[PDB]
Paper text:
Nylon hydrolase (NylC) is one of the three enzymes responsible for the endo-type degradation of the by-products of nylon-6 manufacture (cyclic and linear oligomers of 6-aminohexanoate (Ahx) with a degree of polymerization greater than three) and various aliphatic nylons (e.g., nylon-6 and nylon-66). However, the post-translational autocleavage of the nascent polypeptide between Asn266 and Thr267 generates an active enzyme with an α subunit (27 kDa) and a β subunit (9 kDa). Based on the X-ray-crystallographic structure of NylCA, we reported that four αβ heterodimers (molecules A-D) form a doughnut-shaped quaternary structure. In addition, we proposed that the nucleophilic N-terminal residue Thr267 in the β subunit functions as a catalytic residue for either autocleavage (from precursor to active enzyme) or substrate hydrolysis.
Three amino acid residues corresponding to the substitutions D122G, H130Y, and D36A (increasing the protein stability of NylCp2) and one amino acid residue corresponding to the substitution L137A (decreasing the protein stability) were located at the A/D interface, and the glutamate residue corresponding to the substitution E263Q was found at the A/B interface. In the G122Y130A36Q263 mutant, the acidic amino acid residue Glu263 was replaced with a neutral Gln, suggesting that the alterations in the electrostatic environment induced by the E263Q mutation contributed to improving the subunit interactions. We confirmed that the E263Q substitution in G122Y130A36 (Tm = 84 °C) increased thermostability by 4 °C9. The rmsd of the main-chain atoms between NylCp2 and NylCA and between NylCp2 and NylCp2-G122Y130A36Q263 was generally less than 1 Å, but loop 1 (positions 15–34), loop 2 (positions 88–93), loop 3 (positions 125–133), α3 (positions 246–257), loop 5 (positions 258–269), and loop 7 (positions 319–333) displayed significant structural differences. It should be noted that α1 and its adjacent loop 3 regions showed the largest structural difference between NylCA and NylCp2, whereas a difference of less than 2 Å was found between NylCA and NylCp2-G122Y130A36Q263. Wild-type NylCK and the most thermostable mutant, NylCp2-G122Y130A36Q263 (Tm = 88 °C), should exist mainly as a tetramer of αβ-heterodimers (MAV = 151,384 and 130,895, respectively). The absence of a dimer molecule suggested that the equilibrium of reactions 1 and 2 were optimized to yield tetramers as the major product, leaving monomers as a minor population.
Residue numbers in the entry:
A (entry chain A), B (entry chain A): 19 to 29, 31 to 259, 267 to 355
C (entry chain B), D (entry chain B): 16 to 28, 31 to 260, 267 to 355
The structure:
């Protein structure tokens, strides 16, 4: 039962043109540290929003699967191979941050443009305008800044980057609470799994016991409700987005990687409820650096079908739940 | 903590040609009764398998969305409008049951064949051969029988129809348990929601507290395990299907219905874990009889965004969890 | 081909169904047999005279990686697997998917009822609606699918009114101008490379040759000629709004799942050259792209004819021509 | 069109990028202006001489229901929304998606920075890779997209080397045979019905006319003629294996989401008539089908020209011809 963080009602607010916007390097509430060679993370925000962008930079490039769900997807690129993933606020306007990343990467490549040297950035967005009283959005300059701020082995938890103005629980805006962004990391032997998430759900964040921990908080009661209780009573009366990434170092074929993405994404309906709704633009990127082979056969002491991409997906699903809970903390 | 129902190892077994197969009307462990005009359910099995088929008959026809996930889908038709949904065992061979339904419906239509009089049956299957020691599968005659046995307002819970030899928890077959089929029903005002499920998951059935209730039972310990505990230890050591239907009477557009299907299907990763894996052929049919309008605006005392298809999806997700728990009981 | 200019109007359309008849499968021989050299690939074609309707089965007993491309609002598909031991094409609209169950059951029996997951016999099936072209309600049933498998012959294909093509037809702006088509196949061997195309065109649109001439469908008995449907459509709009094809490519060239899928889409779209309109809401157009995984593409795509000349796209372009030839055989 | 037979080889391809230049947007006028009567639809085209590269923006301020059809292995798409206030087509490969951000930001400013979910300004963008056709690394940036919006003119389209078409090219079996294309548009009014096609063909394949003649791309300077790529591909295989197009249709006819989506697929596939090969792994082919929802189809599909003559499929067939005309304008 954490203390509430109600977003409150928005107030006609100023947009980008009204300000000389200074990027700020986001530090969040605390820094997660981890060991994942070849992966860097940067996060930048404008205090003016507040709104921001979070960039996962994999300079060598990495094979990717994208799983998009719901009626409000805001996606650019969605490539099967990426040098960066850019997550941002600002609704569709915030896809501009990824253009800032792309242009910067072209500069770093000394303006080479061979079809194979193309720098590929996939971007996804949350609508974060109800949670504040301005129209500032992540722009090209903010995406460039997030890339510039990227470093190996660090992630700023909470109100940082794309998570500045993320919020949950939207049966009614009077009960919506600020979330954040979150990350979690596990290493098993040589295997590495990093989960990054920016939950801006219509639904609420739920822990492993089934407790609603963030979103749909009623100030009249002091208690959070699972949305289904509201929905069911609404029917009886009246009749008559989360953007995320997994990054791993395990080699998976295109088909395995795509099904892994679907599996991990669906697993997030455990910690976010409802999820994958028409109201949401839920988008997960599954990224592999293609470093570690799975064994040719899937046995172990733990079972005949225990070491495969599905197994990896189950583990990664837990890392992602932990990240969602970090974002809601 | 229910008593175990381990499937045990399969034993070269006989197939359909070896028997004079008599359809049996499946009664299960108990009958669910409900009120849903225009919907009938029949279930038939062969004791010889044991294996069976469950048919949802909507004689007027109903708009449908199909959501298929994983690497082992076995689907026929997958139509956007159906007179029947046929769920069966027998792996891909059991898709034949749906042909029995289709042919019977043509007969009932007096052999009319105008493109608009076409009788549309969508079928999906589970692989149920590891859970028994024969190669008998649901054939045309069994599908016809299931249709013949269909009645309004009844569903046979447990080991009935397609659920005869369904099983869960397949990290290792020594720990796999027999499930069944399940159904649940809710009425809210005029709104009706029926969930039908045949869980044959690689994963396990999980209740709302997070307890593993069916699948991955270790006879050496007397306890069921969430598969992720096995998977994670397998990695540390070695490196280095569910078919379902919702049926409702609420009018939804094609787009709403499709997103509703996705939402409800993903919600099942709460009660089945892992879910939507490469190993699974998970297929959900969302069917509406298009009887009840939702209101033009989505408000109620419960919230400004409380009465819409997403709301319906959240409610239906709970009905489906209840059905999954019925199947595992 | 030399297409026969003569009309073959289907005519209009209280039809009897399967059990009204003592249905004996007939091995379809069509108008002519195509012979092709592609070890591992057999084709069987069976029909019921009483429809007339039929099924055509491509049997690849090793199993072969497959991509499925389905378009339009009227798809009738079973299985649609990424690996198949057989592809079953049939008449009878959705009822004719039953033929593929006949194939599946027969293959299980041939496998001595083994049911290990790696032993599952996988059949993908697709259908055309062929009831407008005849009075009956007879459809390709499980017996007919089993018969088409039993009748499969290595390296032979019956052109014309045979198997699934027995009551196929084209050009459906008005049924008075619809003509019977058939099924068709074509084959090319280029070096070591083998490409087989099989098609059962039952289009809303018409069959068009490489010169742009409409050669089958939309025959107006009042004019004696076939014109493109667009002329009828444009005249219809000016007046009233005043101010399926099922097919397979089979090749022996190794393609990854991703390459094979995009090859399928390319070849399928290429068929809008020979069938117009195509991929419509009215159509259940479904193409299966199958590779037997026998021969590698070179690791680099060069030749004397260009730096990007030997790759899956190039193979797709070649296969597209084989498919157009098959479409013209069906319409001949 | 009368296509110019003369070659326009792109030539081969250490190129400077955007900030190397003081980049002034130029309003593109192309070779000729198409004028069309479609209230609510404007087109702006802007280029940078220093590329040369550009962007073409279709501005529909009411917003319009859209279906997106994307094919191939090289798609470069932003938004891909089911409802759009603008469509932005650009060069610069994935970098040129930035032009659409310029459009989006400008539209937000025009909306006085209102951000209610029902007020969100939705821009879908798609790109061609046009860097082989020039030395520079200049790409359509946010300023260029904003300029293309600012330059939008109701009912006018600049044909040829203009906007996104400034460095578009066709026929990429070998770059030595690649020719500059352009952008193209065509428009038809039939009764009350309006159909606009816009295309930016940068294909791997070639542009083909209705007679089957290759008219742009794969020009062999050693022969003086263009032949179909398949001749090169087949010769390449015999030797070595021995024994993007971005486009939009815009119409005023009401179509449901399902009809509009299948219309998009039909029209897109129809472009394999005029662009061959098409929908290849090599291509990022993306078509936007947009309806302004002004006029109903009749409730029944009859006319004197047939019982199934007035429906979305019929509209698709008509629109397919408008699109082929646009492709030929681009290649002229
Ligand atoms: Cl929000
Ligand atoms: Cl927890
Ligand atoms: Cl199993
Ligand atoms: Cl429970
Ligand atoms: Cl027909
Ligand atoms: Cl045989
Ligand atoms: Cl190019
Ligand atoms: Cl303007």
């Amino acid at each position: 039962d954490p203390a509430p963080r109600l977003a409150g009602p928005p107030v006609g607010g100023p947009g980008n043109a009204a300000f000389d916007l200074a990027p700020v390097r986001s530090t969040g509430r605390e820094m997660l540290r981890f060991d994942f060679p070849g992966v860097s993370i940067g996060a930048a925000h404008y205090e003016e929003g507040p709104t921001g962008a979070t960039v996962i930079h994999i300079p060598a490039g990495a094979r990717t699967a994208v799983d998009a769900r719901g009626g409000a997807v805001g996606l650019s690129g969605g490539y099967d191979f990426n040098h960066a993933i850019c997550l941002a606020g600002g609704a569709g306007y915030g896809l501009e941050a990824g253009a800032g990343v792309s242009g910067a990467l072209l500069e770093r490549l000394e303006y080479r443009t061979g079809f194979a040297e193309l720098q590929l950035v996939s971007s996804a967005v949350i609508y974060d305008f109800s949670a504040r009283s301005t129209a500032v959005y992540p722009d090209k300059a903010l995406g460039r800044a997030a890339l510039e701020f990227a470093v190996p082995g660090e992630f700023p938890q909470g109100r940082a980057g794309a998570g500045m103005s993320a919020s949950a629980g939207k049966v009614d805006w009077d009960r919506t609470e600020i979330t954040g962004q979150g990350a979690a990391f596990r290493r098993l032997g040589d295997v590495r799994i990093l989960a990054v998430v920016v939950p801006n759900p219509v639904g609420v964040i739920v822990d492993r016991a089934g407790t609603v921990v963030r979103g749909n908080y009623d100030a009249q009661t002091g208690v959070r409700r699972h949305p289904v209780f509201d929905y069911q009573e609404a029917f009886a009366e009246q009749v008559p987005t989360t953007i995320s990434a997994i990054v791993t170092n395990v080699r998976m074929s295109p088909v395995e990687l795509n099904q892994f993405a679907k599996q991990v994404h669906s697993s997030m309906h455990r910690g976010i409820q409802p999820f994958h709704t028409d109201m949401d633009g839920d988008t997960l990127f599954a990224v592999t650096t293609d470093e570690i082979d799975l064994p040719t056969t899937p046995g172990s002491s733990r079972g005949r079908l225990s070491v495969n991409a599905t197994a990896l997906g189950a583990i990664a699903s837990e890392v992602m739940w932990d990240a969602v809970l970090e974002a809601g903390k």
